[PDB]
Amino acid sequence: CPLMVKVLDAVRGSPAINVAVHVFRKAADDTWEPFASGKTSESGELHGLTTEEEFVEGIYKVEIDTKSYWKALGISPFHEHAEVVFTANDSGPRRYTIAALLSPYSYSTTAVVTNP
Amino acid sequence: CPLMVKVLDAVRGSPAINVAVHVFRKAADDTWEPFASGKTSESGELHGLTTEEEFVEGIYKVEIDTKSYWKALGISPFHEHAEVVFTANDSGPRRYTIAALLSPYSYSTTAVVTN
Amino acid sequence: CPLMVKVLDAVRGSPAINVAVHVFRKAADDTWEPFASGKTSESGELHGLTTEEEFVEGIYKVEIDTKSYWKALGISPFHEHAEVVFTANDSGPRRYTIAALLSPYSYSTTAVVTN
Amino acid sequence: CPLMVKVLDAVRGSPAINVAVHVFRKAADDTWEPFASGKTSESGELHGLTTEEEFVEGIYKVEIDTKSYWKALGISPFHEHAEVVFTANDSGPRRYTIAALLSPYSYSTTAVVTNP
Ligand SMILES: CC1=C(CC(=O)O)c2cc(F)ccc2/C1=C\c1ccc([S@](C)=O)cc1
Numbered sequence: 241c242p243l244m245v246k247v248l249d250a251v252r253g254s255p256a257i258n259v260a261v262h263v264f265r266k267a268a269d270d271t272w273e274p275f276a277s278g279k280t281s282e283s284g285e286l287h288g289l290t291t292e293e294e295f296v297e298g299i300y301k302v303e304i305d306t307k308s309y310w311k312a313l314g315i316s317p318f319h320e321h322a323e324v325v326f327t328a329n330d331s332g333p334r335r336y337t338i339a340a341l342l343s344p345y346s347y348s349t350t351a352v353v354t355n356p
Numbered sequence: 357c358p359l360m361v362k363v364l365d366a367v368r369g370s371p372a373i374n375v376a377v378h379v380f381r382k383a384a385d386d387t388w389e390p391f392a393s394g395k396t397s398e399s400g401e402l403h404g405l406t407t408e409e410e411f412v413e414g415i416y417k418v419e420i421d422t423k424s425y426w427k428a429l430g431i432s433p434f435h436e437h438a439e440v441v442f443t444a445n446d447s448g449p450r451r452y453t454i455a456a457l458l459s460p461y462s463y464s465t466t467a468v469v470t471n
Numbered sequence: 472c473p474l475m476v477k478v479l480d481a482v483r484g485s486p487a488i489n490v491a492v493h494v495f496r497k498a499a500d501d502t503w504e505p506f507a508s509g510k511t512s513e514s515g516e517l518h519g520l521t522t523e524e525e526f527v528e529g530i531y532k533v534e535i536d537t538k539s540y541w542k543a544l545g546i547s548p549f550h551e552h553a554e555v556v557f558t559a560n561d562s563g564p565r566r567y568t569i570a571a572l573l574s575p576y577s578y579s580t581t582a583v584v585t586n
Numbered sequence: 587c588p589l590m591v592k593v594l595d596a597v598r599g600s601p602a603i604n605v606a607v608h609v610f611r612k613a614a615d616d617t618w619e620p621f622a623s624g625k626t627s628e629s630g631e632l633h634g635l636t637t638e639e640e641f642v643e644g645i646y647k648v649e650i651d652t653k654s655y656w657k658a659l660g661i662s663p664f665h666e667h668a669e670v671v672f673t674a675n676d677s678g679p680r681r682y683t684i685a686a687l688l689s690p691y692s693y694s695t696t697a698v699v700t701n702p
């Protein structure tokens with residue numbers, strides 16, 4: 241599991257559950273190609289987005305669907321999404337945890353990059 | 357000044373100065389159209405991006421070139437940039453401050469929407 | 472204005488207005504001594520807490536009554552308050568902005584230390 | 587493990603390892619009484635601070651020694667510490683995760699409160 245996404249809800253102080261996460265990889269033609277997607281679990285975690293084999297060097301965009309998340313909670317959020325864009329694996333494979341904290345009008349994303 | 361961007365540096369505890377910021381508006385074909393840009397001032401602020409007349413409802417993207425900022429400081433950044441995407445809604449409150457706090461491996465953004 | 476506190480609300484996307492802020496200085500006996508306090512203005516800012524003369528080097532605590540703020544909004548808060556503790560050092564940069572972003576179950580604070 | 591502390595380093599994009607964490611509980615006399623303390627592990631996590639039996643209702647202060655953490659990394663940080671103060675267990679036992687993200691001049695703390 242080289243790429244994991246963890247989402248917390250700062251309003252409820254809970255995992256942000258059932259958050260849609262779309263991962264894209266910048267293609268040769270500089271377009272975003274869909275790479276992987278998934279939903280955060282009850283732990284606010286999204287595991288198994290990709291594999292060591294599939295998660296090659298690239299510029300990746302992780303788009304966290306914070307908007308749908310807040311709407312489903314009956315809240316009108318400010319942001320369309322939380323999107324983290326980074327070069328991955330440029331000095332060899334790393335494991336990346338994208339940790340996002342969500343408020344209706346604010347998010348932060350932190351990356352935990354570890355060398356397997 | 358309907359749209360303001362303020363950027364702070366969490367590492368140096370300062371405004372994030374000379375950070376390139378590009379604003380895009382989502383065009384009908386779902387592409388991002390350059391709308392406005394600038395560099396944050398010495399207060400880490402970027403004013404005069406747009407005017408009330410130009411700042412119509414729509415989906416906006418505020419792309420903060422965090423990576424160049426960190427490179428300029430000789431600090432290894434994680435993100436390619438910070439991208440803040442939001443719907444400008446005329447409804448109520450109408451001046452938007454997009455606040456960003458930058459760390460090499462983390463960024464946070466908040467919207468201050470006021471009258 | 473050597474010490475400024477700015478507070479934002481991450482839930483409402485606004486300045487956190489009328490937030491009580493108490494500043495303490497660590498006394499020699501390691502107790503916190505009331506130093507300054509105020510309520511954030513409508514810009515979520517609290518100015519005029521102290522003066523250059525009164526703001527000597529030392530350890531300061533900025534206690535933001537986040538709990539009363541959230542209760543006033545009818546929102547259930549986690550923290551009792553937000554406590555920002557730091558050393559004011561004369562050395563270099565010398566105006567301190569203590570920025571706080573409040574969520575019910577989260578707060579963040581950043582220091583903007585400038586000239 | 588009703589109380590856990592997780593600390594990340596936003597500069598290095600890593601767990602904040604060997605971070606001293608002191609937990610205090612407000613006593614009857616309104617003083618802070620030492621409750622528990624520990625160090626974050628290599629995962630930036632601090633488990634086993636307390637027990638279900640020991641972690642009674644109270645106002646607790648979790649003081650994360652961010653200053654020593656940054657100093658040990660040769661960085662001069664702004665804050666003396668990151669200290670989270672909260673009423674715990676007021677509607678029965680909860681599990682509390684105090685998640686802190688550290689930068690030299692900034693921290694955030696989020697609470698993940700779950701009902702066992
Ligand atoms: C640019 C900026 C400002 C402007 C100013 O200081 O005048 C600000 C003011 C506050 F009261 C709180 C946060 C901010 C901010 C960026 C920011 C800080 C923390 C977070 S949290 C960690 O998600 C997010 C964004």
Ligand SMILES: CC1=C(CC(=O)O)c2cc(F)ccc2/C1=C\c1ccc([S@](C)=O)cc1
Nearest residue numbers: 246339340341348592593594685686687694
């Ligand atoms: C999802 C998440 C976790 C879960 C985990 O890593 O186990 C976490 C753990 C920490 F020790 C610190 C932060 C986080 C986090 C998101 C996050 C929180 C605050 C900020 S501040 C507001 O910039 C940014 C991101």
